[PDB]
Amino acid sequence: ELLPYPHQLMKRLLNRISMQSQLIENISMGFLESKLPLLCMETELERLKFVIRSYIRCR
Amino acid sequence: LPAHLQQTFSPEEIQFIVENEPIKIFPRITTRQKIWQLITTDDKALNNMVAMRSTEVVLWIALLLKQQSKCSIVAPQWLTTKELDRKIQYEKTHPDRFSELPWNWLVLARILFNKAKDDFHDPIHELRGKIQDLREIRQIKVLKGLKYLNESHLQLDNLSLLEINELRPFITEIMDKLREIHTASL
Amino acid sequence: FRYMPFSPAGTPFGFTDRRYLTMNEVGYVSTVKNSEQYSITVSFFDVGRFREYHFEDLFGYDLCFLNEKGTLFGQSKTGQIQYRPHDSIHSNWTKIIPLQAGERITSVAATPVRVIVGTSLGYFRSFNQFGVPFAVEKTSPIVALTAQNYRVFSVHYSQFHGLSYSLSELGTSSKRYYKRECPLPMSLPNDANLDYYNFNPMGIKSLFFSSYGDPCIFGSDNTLLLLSKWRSPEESKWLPILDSNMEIWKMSGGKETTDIHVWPLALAYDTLNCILVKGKHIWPEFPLPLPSEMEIRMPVFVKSKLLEENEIQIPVSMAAEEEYLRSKVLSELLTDTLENDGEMYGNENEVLAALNGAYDKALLRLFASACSDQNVEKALSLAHELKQDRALTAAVKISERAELPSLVKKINNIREARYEQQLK
Amino acid sequence: ISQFSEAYNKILRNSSSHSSCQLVIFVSCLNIDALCATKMLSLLFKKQLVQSQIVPIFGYSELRRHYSQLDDNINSLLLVGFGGVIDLEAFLEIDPQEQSFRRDIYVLDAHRPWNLDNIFGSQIIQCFDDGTVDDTLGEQKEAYYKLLELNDLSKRKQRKKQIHEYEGVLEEYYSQGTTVVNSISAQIYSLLSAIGETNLSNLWLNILGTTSLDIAYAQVYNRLYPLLQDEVKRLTPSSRNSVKTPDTLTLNIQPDYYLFLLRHSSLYDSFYYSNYVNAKLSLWNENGKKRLHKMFARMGIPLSTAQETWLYMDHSIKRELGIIFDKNLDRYGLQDIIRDGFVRTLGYRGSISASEFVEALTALLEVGNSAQKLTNLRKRWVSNFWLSWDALDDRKVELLNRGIQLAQDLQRAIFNTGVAILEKKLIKHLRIYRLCVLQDGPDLDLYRNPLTLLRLGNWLIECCAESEDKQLLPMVLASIDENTDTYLVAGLTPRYPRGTKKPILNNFSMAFQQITAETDAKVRIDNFESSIIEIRREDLSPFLEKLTLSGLL
Amino acid sequence: NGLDLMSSITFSQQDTNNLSHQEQEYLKEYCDLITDLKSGDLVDIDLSGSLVPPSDVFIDVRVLKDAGEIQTEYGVFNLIKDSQFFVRQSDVERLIQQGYLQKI
């Protein structure tokens, strides 16, 4: 069956994704020796993005 | 519309779930402070590490740092030639049970042996000898546990996550044809 | 009896032909036989601030001391040293030591200001970090030497004096000695490991320092000592804190075994990093395995009284007394390091606070058992040590549950005298 | 002048960023030495996370189209194999583009003439000017400085005599033969020793680096050998080994012989298709093939066993091969057979030596895949380059065992051509050099690749210029096909029969170059090397007569 | 359709004859129903492709025989035939689906 949608938490995450995706562009442009922290946050954001893109597209 | 399989997990979506469980590392870059920071959403601590002092990170970061050799994956409690011998001799003397598996049974035996094969105690014919031996004892009792299936109930007390995602589309397509005979005759 | 050159946690050749020369908490140095020459590797445990290299020997070095600033090599017969700084800006230098007839070099040291070469007749030559000599001093023969940030620890020995340490601190110009030749409690020795005792007769495996500034020494009794209150002249005690004959016996399921050994590298806040070598030969081999850990336990267990209670499971009535000692000892090494020099990292206050919380809590597993067997005097004296005051009224509610009513008065007699103390 | 670690950080300050095409490297498709030198230049840029290109370049005109078209994100450039001899500012037409130039070029070369307008005048072209190839020669230096400065008749004629004598010194340099000083794949390992990444795999790309120039090249291999016999002893797991576990790659030095492909063919089929057996027994005739069976009589090997493949020989014969090769090998002169070589076993697979690996890469580079019929061939070589780049690794062994069975059918088609020359005797024995021109025969399609003529030409040089003193003269080869009659000619060099004082050994760059600017009769210089060209069929006869004139040898 | 093309009427579904007149107008309106959805999420513009889970952030991409130096978004690529790369997986998934770069 079709389960009831989590209407309250999934307003937070779409307001949490667009916040940090500016902060990656703000650090990586605003920096210009440590290329390692900038490739962990780039990996995680494209890993939280895959859960939503395979949850909405499953309903 | 996924339309490939759409009812099970494909086994590239099983290495995505097991990579959210923490293990220990022996780091090789300090970055603590003395008297720029990793600010990710889901873990957001352990900026403060010391060279050769154990800490606990999530597993998908500790495969990023092994590729550059700035970490070293420690063994868990089960990758031990002294510990896996009790979990084999349990299996012979109890032909009805499943002995015990830490639920990342097969998956953590793959991502560690391909990537981190310098940190155990002799994986050659000591750990790949047992883990293939413990998968062929276990795959007998699954095969004898399907002559006894019914149309109301089943018990599968302790099975892993990869020994189930190869067995869903066999059982739930047959047990949906034993339900539609017993209730169609009533 | 013979003198052999000593280096921290070295290992001999054996039947093979490549060994380590030193091994400590920064890196490990290995050597490899080329029949004519040697190829020395300097590999590091840290990766970020340092690089590894390798170079070719033409003299036959067998003494080294690897630390953060430099890498002081040595030669045991010709008296030839070489100092290779990790920085590319400062250049090397080489000096040849005067030697008399029938003399060796035992061990060297590489403090950030001084450079110490101690020979096997007692001479104590001290350079500066470029090669200008400062002193020549005659002491007892030296068989080990090590250093941290500014302090220097050493072990004298003679054929008639006996073992004696000495703990000094060559600062900028301050040369405040602390202990000059006081005696030291350790047992020297008197098979597959006969190749080891020809290499190091003294039996000291690897002496080092802590990360907080406390000397340690890992004897051949397999019992890591430690020195406390060394800033005071008349309060130094040698607290043993680990038995490697006991932690192995627990982990082998209550059994004697001759396969697991212990090789130490360094010490942390409360953990010891160890190379658990498995085999007959008690030195590690190449490649160097991952350093495991091991916790410290004060030696209060009994080898016999655990076996009558049947991995090894301990009853709580015996495990309670050990945590009483262990948080008692660890506080005295932490409460003075802040008061005299201070804290390095900043988080030293909260671990101090949570260590007191393990101190009073572990006493109350014992305090309740003292009321269980109808004893008022034994349970009375235990309530004079709780410096935490919020556990004092917590003990009163355990006094009523055991129904020893006179004991309930005595604890409230303790609270009032410590209450009037605060007002003055 | 420029060492490595100060130049290594000069490439990381301007390449670690967000955009992808920050640096671009160029590889010549022919030098196997230039193949291993970039395979371990990707591993160095994979552990430090820099994004790049790897573009193969065949010709000399194809460098101009690829460079003069795609110039947006050149924050660095890199160039391996090329760029040694020909002046790059005068060929790419580069002008001042703003200290703090926008573009750096780091050439890597293995050739003799330093081409002083690249090393000196280093505005943008970063040199490679450590004293390895440089050798710190000063007479070249001051003459270049006492030239670029542009009673007055007395000093100016004295200046004109000083102009006259100094260009005489500049005609003592720039008048020399092009051969190899150092290998490239030993030079990059000297950069990897200083940074601190030397694995066991990054050693296996020097043993394949400096064995490619042992067989068919000058031998500096005798001077590069004691440096690699110590880096193997240094990285060794233990003295006594476990008994053959399915892990644990162990490379270790072993007494290895000079035959071609012992481990993957029979004994008898290796004694035919060799060089230092063919050079001493003259196997192309019939009078020498009787002497070959005369060896196996003495050695105690039947002629059924000696053609079984080397896996299925008996246990008590491969045990005793190091012993029989020294009692009976003296009488036929073959005593320079036993050398010391390297063997890399990956567990249960089996042993492959060093020389038996570089044959399987020189034979995977041309097989096993008007003017616009030409460039449709050059895309069959550039696309063939990635067919060895993958096979170099340790994961794909089904790609390697295609290579060995493509290698034995290379040196079976050469041996049946090189016999058909030495019966008809198509050699002109002229007063300056020797000449051969091949016009007709079987399988003449194979000989369009420059790595195939140098295989056959290396079989002729060690054949006739042998231990027997006749003379010492260069060869000139010329093969032919259809399709506008290309006539791929190639100048070769003489050798000594291994028993090393004259290292110059080449002249076909200078004296050839004067003729192509004299009539320019239908010639194209389209190679990394200056000693191989094409020429039309009507231009062969008047060109060769001019070679005998103005002889510089 | 709608994957690094953003208006793909032609160039895909190369038959355009096996469909009826009614099934060829149903499809063309349905692709405009998709682009309503990708404008109100902003998880990613065109959330369509890549249902493979992400791993191994830096990949090796070998060009298979398609010149053009076509790409402008996130920098030019200067694309030449048979020359492999080391770029991250975010910029190639828009081209690895076109049959244009062969290796993963």
Curated annotation (Swiss-Prot), chain A:
It is found in: Nucleus. It comes from the Eukaryota. Required for DNA replication. Functions as part of the GINS complex which plays an essential role in the initiation of DNA replication by binding to DNA replication origins and facilitating the assembly of the DNA replication machinery. Belongs to the GINS4/SLD5 family. Component of the GINS complex which is a heterotetramer composed of SLD5, PSF1, PSF2 and PSF3. Interacts with PSF2. This is DNA replication complex GINS protein SLD5.
UniProtKB/Swiss-Prot annotation, chain B:
It comes from the Eukaryota. InterPro entries: GINS_A, GINS_bundle-like_dom_sf, GINS_Psf2, PSF2_N. It is found in: Nucleus. Pfam families: PSF2_N, Sld5. CDD domains: GINS_A_psf2, GINS_B_Psf2. GO terms for cellular component: CMG complex; DNA replication preinitiation complex; GINS complex; nuclear replication fork; nucleus. One of its GO terms (biological process) is DNA-templated DNA replication. Signal peptide: none annotated. Keywords: DNA replication, Nucleus. Its main location: nucleus. PANTHER family: DNA REPLICATION COMPLEX GINS PROTEIN PSF2 (PTHR12772:SF0). Belongs to the GINS2/PSF2 family. Component of the GINS complex which is a heterotetramer of SLD5, PSF1, PSF2 and PSF3. Interacts with PSF1 and SLD5. Functions as part of the GINS complex which plays an essential role in the initiation of DNA replication by binding to DNA replication origins and facilitating the assembly of the DNA replication machinery. This is DNA replication complex GINS protein PSF2.
UniProtKB/Swiss-Prot annotation, chain C:
The gene is CTF4. WD repeats lie at residues 219-259. This is DNA polymerase alpha-binding protein. Present with 3280 molecules/cell in log phase SD medium. Accessory factor for DNA replication. It plays a role in accurately duplicating the genome in vivo. It is found in: Nucleus. It comes from Saccharomyces cerevisiae (strain ATCC 204508 / S288c) (Baker's yeast). The chain holds residues 474 to 927 of 927 of the full protein.
Swiss-Prot record, chain E:
It is found in: Nucleus. One of its GO terms (biological process) is double-strand break repair via break-induced replication. Its main location: nucleus. Coiled coil: none annotated. Required for DNA replication. Functions as part of the GINS complex which plays an essential role in the initiation of DNA replication by binding to DNA replication origins and facilitating the assembly of the DNA replication machinery. Required for the chromatin binding of CDC45. The chain holds residues 105 to 208 of 208 of the full protein. Component of the GINS complex which is a heterotetramer of SLD5, PSF1, PSF2 and PSF3. Interacts with PSF2. Keywords: Cell cycle, DNA replication, Nucleus. The keyword Cell cycle applies. Belongs to the GINS1/PSF1 family. One of its GO terms (cellular component) is CMG complex. Present with 1431 molecules/cell in log phase SD medium. This is DNA replication complex GINS protein PSF1. Signal peptide: none annotated. It comes from Saccharomyces cerevisiae (strain ATCC 204508 / S288c) (Baker's yeast).
